Amino acid sequence: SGAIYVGNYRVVNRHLATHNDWANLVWEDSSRDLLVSSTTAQGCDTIARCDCQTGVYYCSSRRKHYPVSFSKPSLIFVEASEYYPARYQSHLMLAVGHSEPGDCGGILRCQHGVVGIVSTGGNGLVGFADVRDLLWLDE
Ligand SMILES: COc1c(NC(=O)N2CCC[C@H](C(N)=O)C2)cccc1C(F)(F)F
Ligand SMILES: [Zn+2]
């Protein structure tokens, strides 16, 4: 679990969005596993606007932060799950690191701000949904 809170927006994994997220929907994209909902309160977070390929993520299944080197946002094949058929997920960045399904939502940050959230993983890999291209989150 986990979310990004920037301005009047809440960014979550689309597959973990609640009834209230859908009732306050701003934008969603199944191909990216992202959903953004509106908030009444002003959020705590800053979005990175950079091309960093290293950073630190929070791993809830270890209660620890880990440093990672990750690939540039790209189209990656993701096996079928209960949430989605087998498909290519776009804007996904992979890294070697521990992750379990419940780790989705953990934030990846670099020195500039929030980069993205945990969205996929397995076999010593962790995948992050990028949010740095979503310039409208800042206005
Ligand atoms: C494949 O199972 C996982 C997952 N689950 C997912 O990646 N997915 C399930 C949720 C939607 C994701 C997506 N964005 O489509 C895919 C995450 C971390 C670790 C593992 C594990 F180690 F068990 F293999
Ligand atoms: Zn950066």
Short mmCIF file of N, CA and C and ligand atoms in Angstrom, two decimals:
data_model
loop_
_atom_site.label_atom_id
_atom_site.label_comp_id
_atom_site.label_asym_id
_atom_site.label_seq_id
_atom_site.Cartn_x
_atom_site.Cartn_y
_atom_site.Cartn_z
N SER A 1 0.83 -1.22 0.00
CA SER A 1 0.00 0.00 0.00
C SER A 1 0.85 1.25 0.00
N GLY A 2 0.25 2.37 -0.41
CA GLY A 2 0.90 3.66 -0.38
C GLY A 2 0.45 4.60 -1.47
N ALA A 3 0.63 5.90 -1.25
CA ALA A 3 0.23 6.89 -2.19
C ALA A 3 1.16 8.09 -2.18
N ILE A 4 1.08 8.93 -3.25
CA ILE A 4 1.77 10.22 -3.32
C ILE A 4 0.71 11.28 -3.13
N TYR A 5 0.97 12.25 -2.28
CA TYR A 5 0.05 13.37 -2.06
C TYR A 5 0.68 14.68 -2.49
N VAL A 6 0.29 15.22 -3.66
CA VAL A 6 0.88 16.44 -4.21
C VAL A 6 -0.25 17.41 -4.55
N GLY A 7 -0.23 18.62 -3.98
CA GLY A 7 -1.28 19.60 -4.23
C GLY A 7 -2.63 19.05 -3.81
N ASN A 8 -3.62 19.10 -4.71
CA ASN A 8 -4.92 18.49 -4.40
C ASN A 8 -5.10 17.15 -5.09
N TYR A 9 -4.01 16.39 -5.26
CA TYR A 9 -4.07 15.08 -5.91
C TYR A 9 -3.51 13.99 -5.01
N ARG A 10 -4.05 12.77 -5.16
CA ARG A 10 -3.62 11.55 -4.52
C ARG A 10 -3.29 10.57 -5.67
N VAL A 11 -2.03 10.11 -5.77
CA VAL A 11 -1.62 9.17 -6.82
C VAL A 11 -1.48 7.81 -6.17
N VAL A 12 -2.21 6.81 -6.69
CA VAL A 12 -2.16 5.45 -6.14
C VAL A 12 -1.96 4.44 -7.30
N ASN A 13 -1.65 3.17 -6.95
CA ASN A 13 -1.70 2.10 -7.96
C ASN A 13 -3.15 1.92 -8.36
N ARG A 14 -3.42 1.88 -9.68
CA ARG A 14 -4.82 1.75 -10.14
C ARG A 14 -5.47 0.48 -9.56
N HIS A 15 -4.68 -0.61 -9.42
CA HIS A 15 -5.25 -1.88 -8.94
C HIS A 15 -5.59 -1.86 -7.44
N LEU A 16 -5.11 -0.84 -6.70
CA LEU A 16 -5.40 -0.68 -5.28
C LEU A 16 -6.33 0.52 -5.00
N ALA A 17 -6.85 1.18 -6.05
CA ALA A 17 -7.72 2.34 -5.84
C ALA A 17 -9.00 1.95 -5.09
N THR A 18 -9.43 2.83 -4.20
CA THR A 18 -10.64 2.58 -3.40
C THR A 18 -11.89 3.10 -4.09
N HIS A 19 -13.07 2.82 -3.48
CA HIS A 19 -14.34 3.37 -3.98
C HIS A 19 -14.27 4.90 -3.98
N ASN A 20 -13.71 5.49 -2.90
CA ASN A 20 -13.58 6.94 -2.84
C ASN A 20 -12.64 7.51 -3.90
N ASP A 21 -11.51 6.81 -4.22
CA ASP A 21 -10.64 7.26 -5.33
C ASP A 21 -11.44 7.34 -6.64
N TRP A 22 -12.22 6.30 -6.94
CA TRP A 22 -13.00 6.28 -8.18
C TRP A 22 -14.09 7.34 -8.20
N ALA A 23 -14.67 7.65 -7.03
CA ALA A 23 -15.71 8.71 -6.95
C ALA A 23 -15.12 10.12 -7.10
N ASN A 24 -13.80 10.27 -6.86
CA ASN A 24 -13.14 11.55 -7.01
C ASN A 24 -12.06 11.46 -8.12
N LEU A 25 -12.33 10.67 -9.16
CA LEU A 25 -11.39 10.42 -10.26
C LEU A 25 -10.97 11.64 -11.05
N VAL A 26 -9.65 11.80 -11.24
CA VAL A 26 -9.11 12.87 -12.09
C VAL A 26 -8.61 12.25 -13.42
N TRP A 27 -7.85 11.14 -13.29
CA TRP A 27 -7.23 10.48 -14.44
C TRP A 27 -6.84 9.07 -14.04
N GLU A 28 -6.94 8.13 -14.96
CA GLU A 28 -6.47 6.76 -14.71
C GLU A 28 -5.95 6.16 -16.01
N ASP A 29 -4.99 5.23 -15.90
CA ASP A 29 -4.44 4.58 -17.10
C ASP A 29 -4.06 3.14 -16.70
N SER A 30 -4.85 2.16 -17.17
CA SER A 30 -4.60 0.76 -16.88
C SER A 30 -3.24 0.34 -17.41
N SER A 31 -2.84 0.88 -18.58
CA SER A 31 -1.53 0.49 -19.15
C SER A 31 -0.38 0.94 -18.27
N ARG A 32 -0.58 1.92 -17.38
CA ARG A 32 0.50 2.36 -16.48
C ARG A 32 0.30 1.89 -15.02
N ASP A 33 -0.84 1.27 -14.70
CA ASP A 33 -1.23 0.91 -13.33
C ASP A 33 -1.31 2.16 -12.43
N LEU A 34 -1.76 3.29 -12.98
CA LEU A 34 -1.89 4.53 -12.18
C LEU A 34 -3.30 5.07 -12.14
N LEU A 35 -3.66 5.67 -11.01
CA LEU A 35 -4.92 6.38 -10.88
C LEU A 35 -4.63 7.58 -9.99
N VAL A 36 -5.19 8.72 -10.37
CA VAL A 36 -5.08 9.98 -9.60
C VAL A 36 -6.49 10.44 -9.23
N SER A 37 -6.69 10.72 -7.95
CA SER A 37 -7.98 11.22 -7.43
C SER A 37 -7.76 12.60 -6.79
N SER A 38 -8.86 13.36 -6.61
CA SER A 38 -8.76 14.69 -6.00
C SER A 38 -8.88 14.63 -4.49
N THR A 39 -8.25 15.59 -3.79
CA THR A 39 -8.25 15.65 -2.32
C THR A 39 -8.78 17.00 -1.86
N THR A 40 -9.30 17.06 -0.65
CA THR A 40 -9.73 18.34 -0.09
C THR A 40 -8.54 19.03 0.62
N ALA A 41 -7.66 18.24 1.24
CA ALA A 41 -6.50 18.78 1.95
C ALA A 41 -5.28 18.89 1.01
N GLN A 42 -4.37 19.81 1.30
CA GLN A 42 -3.15 20.03 0.53
C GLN A 42 -2.13 18.96 0.86
N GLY A 43 -1.51 18.34 -0.15
CA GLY A 43 -0.58 17.22 0.09
C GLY A 43 0.83 17.52 0.55
N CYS A 44 1.48 16.52 1.21
CA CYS A 44 2.82 16.58 1.79
C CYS A 44 4.03 16.44 0.81
N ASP A 45 3.85 15.90 -0.42
CA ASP A 45 4.94 15.51 -1.35
C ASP A 45 5.31 16.54 -2.50
N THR A 46 6.55 16.42 -3.15
CA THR A 46 7.25 17.14 -4.27
C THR A 46 7.59 16.08 -5.37
N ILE A 47 7.27 16.34 -6.64
CA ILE A 47 7.58 15.39 -7.73
C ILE A 47 8.90 15.77 -8.38
N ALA A 48 9.80 14.81 -8.56
CA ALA A 48 11.08 15.03 -9.25
C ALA A 48 10.80 15.32 -10.73
N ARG A 49 11.59 16.25 -11.29
CA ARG A 49 11.51 16.56 -12.74
C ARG A 49 12.97 16.48 -13.18
N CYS A 50 13.39 15.25 -13.49
CA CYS A 50 14.80 14.94 -13.72
C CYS A 50 14.91 13.65 -14.56
N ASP A 51 16.18 13.24 -14.84
CA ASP A 51 16.39 11.96 -15.52
C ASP A 51 17.26 11.04 -14.64
N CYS A 52 17.13 11.13 -13.30
CA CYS A 52 17.90 10.24 -12.40
C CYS A 52 17.55 8.78 -12.70
N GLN A 53 18.54 7.89 -12.68
CA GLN A 53 18.37 6.44 -12.81
C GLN A 53 18.86 5.71 -11.54
N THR A 54 19.10 6.47 -10.42
CA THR A 54 19.39 5.87 -9.13
C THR A 54 18.48 6.60 -8.11
N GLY A 55 18.19 5.91 -7.03
CA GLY A 55 17.35 6.48 -5.99
C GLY A 55 17.19 5.50 -4.83
N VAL A 56 16.19 5.77 -3.97
CA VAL A 56 15.94 4.93 -2.78
C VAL A 56 14.43 4.67 -2.71
N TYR A 57 14.04 3.41 -2.46
CA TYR A 57 12.60 3.08 -2.33
C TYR A 57 12.30 2.50 -0.96
N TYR A 58 11.02 2.64 -0.55
CA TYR A 58 10.58 2.05 0.69
C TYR A 58 9.95 0.68 0.40
N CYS A 59 10.41 -0.33 1.15
CA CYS A 59 9.96 -1.73 1.01
C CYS A 59 9.23 -2.11 2.30
N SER A 60 7.88 -2.13 2.24
CA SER A 60 7.11 -2.43 3.42
C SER A 60 7.30 -3.84 3.98
N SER A 61 7.57 -4.82 3.08
CA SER A 61 7.79 -6.21 3.51
C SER A 61 9.12 -6.44 4.24
N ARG A 62 9.96 -5.40 4.33
CA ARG A 62 11.19 -5.43 5.12
C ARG A 62 11.24 -4.26 6.13
N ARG A 63 10.24 -3.34 6.11
CA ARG A 63 10.27 -2.11 6.92
C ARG A 63 11.60 -1.36 6.74
N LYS A 64 12.08 -1.30 5.49
CA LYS A 64 13.41 -0.70 5.22
C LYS A 64 13.42 0.04 3.90
N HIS A 65 14.32 1.02 3.77
CA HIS A 65 14.58 1.69 2.52
C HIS A 65 15.82 1.06 1.89
N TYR A 66 15.81 0.93 0.56
CA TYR A 66 16.93 0.34 -0.19
C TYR A 66 17.34 1.24 -1.34
N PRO A 67 18.65 1.38 -1.55
CA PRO A 67 19.13 2.12 -2.73
C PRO A 67 19.03 1.21 -3.98
N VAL A 68 18.71 1.80 -5.12
CA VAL A 68 18.53 1.04 -6.38
C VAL A 68 19.01 1.80 -7.57
N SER A 69 19.49 1.03 -8.58
CA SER A 69 19.75 1.57 -9.91
C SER A 69 18.56 1.04 -10.75
N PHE A 70 17.87 1.89 -11.51
CA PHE A 70 16.68 1.43 -12.26
C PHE A 70 16.76 1.82 -13.74
N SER A 71 16.09 1.02 -14.58
CA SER A 71 16.05 1.32 -16.00
C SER A 71 15.13 2.49 -16.34
N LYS A 72 15.35 3.13 -17.49
CA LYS A 72 14.52 4.24 -17.95
C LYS A 72 13.07 3.76 -18.19
N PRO A 73 12.07 4.65 -18.01
CA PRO A 73 10.66 4.22 -18.22
C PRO A 73 10.45 3.57 -19.59
N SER A 74 9.88 2.36 -19.60
CA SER A 74 9.72 1.63 -20.85
C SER A 74 8.50 0.71 -20.83
N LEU A 75 8.22 0.07 -22.00
CA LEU A 75 7.11 -0.87 -22.14
C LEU A 75 7.65 -2.24 -21.79
N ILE A 76 7.08 -2.88 -20.78
CA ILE A 76 7.55 -4.16 -20.26
C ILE A 76 6.43 -5.14 -20.16
N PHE A 77 6.64 -6.38 -20.62
CA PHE A 77 5.62 -7.42 -20.52
C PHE A 77 5.40 -7.79 -19.05
N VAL A 78 4.13 -7.78 -18.61
CA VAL A 78 3.74 -8.16 -17.25
C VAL A 78 2.74 -9.32 -17.34
N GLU A 79 3.07 -10.44 -16.71
CA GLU A 79 2.24 -11.64 -16.69
C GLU A 79 0.84 -11.33 -16.12
N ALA A 80 -0.18 -12.12 -16.53
CA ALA A 80 -1.54 -11.94 -16.02
C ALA A 80 -1.57 -12.09 -14.49
N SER A 81 -2.44 -11.31 -13.86
CA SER A 81 -2.65 -11.38 -12.43
C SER A 81 -4.17 -11.35 -12.22
N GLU A 82 -4.62 -11.32 -10.96
CA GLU A 82 -6.06 -11.18 -10.68
C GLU A 82 -6.61 -9.83 -11.13
N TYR A 83 -5.71 -8.83 -11.26
CA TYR A 83 -6.09 -7.47 -11.58
C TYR A 83 -6.08 -7.15 -13.05
N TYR A 84 -5.22 -7.81 -13.83
CA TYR A 84 -5.08 -7.47 -15.26
C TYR A 84 -4.75 -8.69 -16.08
N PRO A 85 -5.20 -8.72 -17.35
CA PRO A 85 -4.75 -9.78 -18.25
C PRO A 85 -3.26 -9.58 -18.56
N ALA A 86 -2.62 -10.56 -19.20
CA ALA A 86 -1.24 -10.43 -19.64
C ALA A 86 -1.18 -9.23 -20.64
N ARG A 87 -0.24 -8.30 -20.43
CA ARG A 87 -0.19 -7.07 -21.23
C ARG A 87 1.19 -6.41 -21.12
N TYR A 88 1.43 -5.37 -21.91
CA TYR A 88 2.62 -4.56 -21.75
C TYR A 88 2.25 -3.37 -20.87
N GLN A 89 2.99 -3.18 -19.78
CA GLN A 89 2.78 -2.03 -18.92
C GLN A 89 3.78 -0.96 -19.35
N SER A 90 3.29 0.23 -19.62
CA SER A 90 4.11 1.34 -20.06
C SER A 90 4.65 2.18 -18.88
N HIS A 91 5.71 2.97 -19.17
CA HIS A 91 6.32 3.90 -18.21
C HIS A 91 6.81 3.15 -16.96
N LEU A 92 7.25 1.88 -17.13
CA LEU A 92 7.72 1.05 -16.02
C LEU A 92 9.24 1.02 -15.98
N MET A 93 9.79 1.08 -14.76
CA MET A 93 11.25 1.07 -14.56
C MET A 93 11.60 -0.10 -13.69
N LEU A 94 12.57 -0.92 -14.09
CA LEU A 94 12.93 -2.09 -13.28
C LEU A 94 14.24 -1.92 -12.53
N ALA A 95 14.32 -2.60 -11.41
CA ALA A 95 15.56 -2.61 -10.62
C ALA A 95 15.70 -3.91 -9.88
N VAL A 96 16.95 -4.24 -9.49
CA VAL A 96 17.15 -5.41 -8.66
C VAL A 96 16.92 -5.00 -7.20
N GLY A 97 16.00 -5.68 -6.56
CA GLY A 97 15.60 -5.34 -5.20
C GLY A 97 14.47 -6.25 -4.77
N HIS A 98 14.28 -6.38 -3.48
CA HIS A 98 13.21 -7.19 -2.93
C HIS A 98 11.84 -6.53 -3.05
N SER A 99 10.83 -7.31 -3.42
CA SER A 99 9.46 -6.83 -3.40
C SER A 99 8.51 -8.02 -3.35
N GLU A 100 7.39 -7.79 -2.68
CA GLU A 100 6.26 -8.69 -2.54
C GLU A 100 5.00 -7.92 -3.01
N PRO A 101 3.88 -8.60 -3.37
CA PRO A 101 2.72 -7.86 -3.90
C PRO A 101 2.24 -6.67 -3.06
N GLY A 102 2.25 -6.82 -1.74
CA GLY A 102 1.80 -5.75 -0.84
C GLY A 102 2.75 -4.55 -0.78
N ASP A 103 3.95 -4.68 -1.36
CA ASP A 103 4.87 -3.54 -1.42
C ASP A 103 4.44 -2.47 -2.41
N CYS A 104 3.46 -2.75 -3.27
CA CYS A 104 2.96 -1.78 -4.27
C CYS A 104 2.50 -0.52 -3.55
N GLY A 105 2.90 0.64 -4.05
CA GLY A 105 2.57 1.91 -3.42
C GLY A 105 3.74 2.55 -2.70
N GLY A 106 4.78 1.76 -2.41
CA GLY A 106 5.99 2.31 -1.77
C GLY A 106 6.64 3.33 -2.68
N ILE A 107 7.11 4.44 -2.11
CA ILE A 107 7.68 5.50 -2.94
C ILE A 107 9.15 5.26 -3.29
N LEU A 108 9.50 5.61 -4.52
CA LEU A 108 10.89 5.70 -5.03
C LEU A 108 11.21 7.20 -5.12
N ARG A 109 12.33 7.63 -4.50
CA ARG A 109 12.71 9.05 -4.52
C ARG A 109 14.15 9.16 -4.88
N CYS A 110 14.47 10.26 -5.50
CA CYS A 110 15.88 10.66 -5.73
C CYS A 110 16.06 12.00 -4.98
N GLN A 111 17.25 12.64 -5.11
CA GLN A 111 17.50 13.93 -4.46
C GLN A 111 16.56 15.05 -4.90
N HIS A 112 15.83 14.89 -6.01
CA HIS A 112 14.94 15.94 -6.53
C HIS A 112 13.49 15.83 -6.08
N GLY A 113 13.10 14.65 -5.57
CA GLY A 113 11.73 14.42 -5.16
C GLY A 113 11.26 13.01 -5.48
N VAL A 114 9.95 12.87 -5.50
CA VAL A 114 9.34 11.58 -5.78
C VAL A 114 9.47 11.23 -7.27
N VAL A 115 9.92 10.04 -7.56
CA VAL A 115 10.12 9.55 -8.91
C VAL A 115 8.92 8.68 -9.38
N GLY A 116 8.46 7.81 -8.48
CA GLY A 116 7.37 6.87 -8.81
C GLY A 116 7.00 5.97 -7.64
N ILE A 117 6.12 4.98 -7.92
CA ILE A 117 5.70 4.07 -6.86
C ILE A 117 5.89 2.62 -7.28
N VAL A 118 6.15 1.73 -6.31
CA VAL A 118 6.25 0.28 -6.61
C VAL A 118 4.95 -0.20 -7.30
N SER A 119 5.07 -0.95 -8.41
CA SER A 119 3.91 -1.44 -9.15
C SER A 119 4.05 -2.92 -9.52
N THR A 120 5.30 -3.44 -9.68
CA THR A 120 5.47 -4.87 -10.06
C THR A 120 6.68 -5.45 -9.28
N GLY A 121 6.88 -6.76 -9.35
CA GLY A 121 8.07 -7.34 -8.79
C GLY A 121 8.11 -8.84 -8.98
N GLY A 122 9.16 -9.42 -8.45
CA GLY A 122 9.35 -10.86 -8.43
C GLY A 122 10.77 -11.24 -8.66
N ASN A 123 11.18 -12.40 -8.13
CA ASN A 123 12.50 -13.00 -8.33
C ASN A 123 13.66 -12.08 -8.19
N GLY A 124 13.65 -11.26 -7.14
CA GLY A 124 14.71 -10.31 -6.87
C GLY A 124 14.64 -9.07 -7.74
N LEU A 125 13.49 -8.80 -8.35
CA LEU A 125 13.23 -7.60 -9.13
C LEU A 125 12.13 -6.77 -8.43
N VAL A 126 12.14 -5.47 -8.72
CA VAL A 126 11.10 -4.54 -8.28
C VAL A 126 10.87 -3.55 -9.43
N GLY A 127 9.61 -3.32 -9.79
CA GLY A 127 9.27 -2.39 -10.87
C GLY A 127 8.49 -1.20 -10.34
N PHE A 128 8.81 -0.03 -10.86
CA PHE A 128 8.22 1.24 -10.40
C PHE A 128 7.48 1.93 -11.56
N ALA A 129 6.28 2.40 -11.27
CA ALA A 129 5.52 3.19 -12.22
C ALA A 129 6.06 4.62 -12.12
N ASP A 130 6.62 5.15 -13.22
CA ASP A 130 7.13 6.52 -13.26
C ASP A 130 6.00 7.54 -13.19
N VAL A 131 6.24 8.68 -12.48
CA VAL A 131 5.28 9.78 -12.47
C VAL A 131 5.93 11.10 -12.93
N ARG A 132 7.23 11.10 -13.26
CA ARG A 132 7.92 12.37 -13.56
C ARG A 132 7.48 13.07 -14.80
N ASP A 133 6.84 12.33 -15.73
CA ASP A 133 6.34 12.98 -16.95
C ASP A 133 4.98 13.66 -16.75
N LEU A 134 4.30 13.43 -15.64
CA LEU A 134 2.96 13.99 -15.37
C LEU A 134 3.06 15.40 -14.84
N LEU A 135 3.33 16.34 -15.75
CA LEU A 135 3.62 17.72 -15.34
C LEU A 135 2.46 18.42 -14.68
N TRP A 136 1.22 18.02 -15.05
CA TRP A 136 0.01 18.61 -14.51
C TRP A 136 -0.15 18.34 -13.01
N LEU A 137 0.61 17.38 -12.40
CA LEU A 137 0.48 17.12 -10.96
C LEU A 137 0.85 18.36 -10.13
N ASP A 138 1.71 19.25 -10.69
CA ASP A 138 2.24 20.46 -10.04
C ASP A 138 1.40 21.70 -10.18
N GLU A 139 0.25 21.62 -10.85
CA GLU A 139 -0.63 22.77 -11.01
C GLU A 139 -2.09 22.34 -10.79
C1 LIG B 1 4.11 -11.52 -9.44
O1 LIG B 1 3.90 -11.35 -8.03
C2 LIG B 1 4.58 -10.31 -7.43
C3 LIG B 1 4.10 -9.00 -7.55
N1 LIG B 1 2.89 -8.77 -8.24
C4 LIG B 1 2.85 -8.05 -9.38
O2 LIG B 1 3.88 -7.69 -9.94
N2 LIG B 1 1.62 -7.85 -9.94
C5 LIG B 1 0.36 -8.05 -9.21
C6 LIG B 1 -0.38 -6.73 -8.98
C7 LIG B 1 -0.50 -5.93 -10.28
C8 LIG B 1 0.87 -5.74 -10.94
C9 LIG B 1 0.78 -4.94 -12.23
N3 LIG B 1 1.30 -3.72 -12.19
O3 LIG B 1 0.28 -5.43 -13.25
C10 LIG B 1 1.51 -7.11 -11.20
C11 LIG B 1 4.79 -7.96 -6.94
C12 LIG B 1 5.94 -8.23 -6.22
C13 LIG B 1 6.40 -9.53 -6.10
C14 LIG B 1 5.74 -10.59 -6.69
C15 LIG B 1 6.23 -11.98 -6.44
F1 LIG B 1 7.42 -11.99 -5.79
F2 LIG B 1 5.38 -12.68 -5.71
F3 LIG B 1 6.44 -12.65 -7.55
ZN ZN B 2 16.37 13.19 -9.62
#
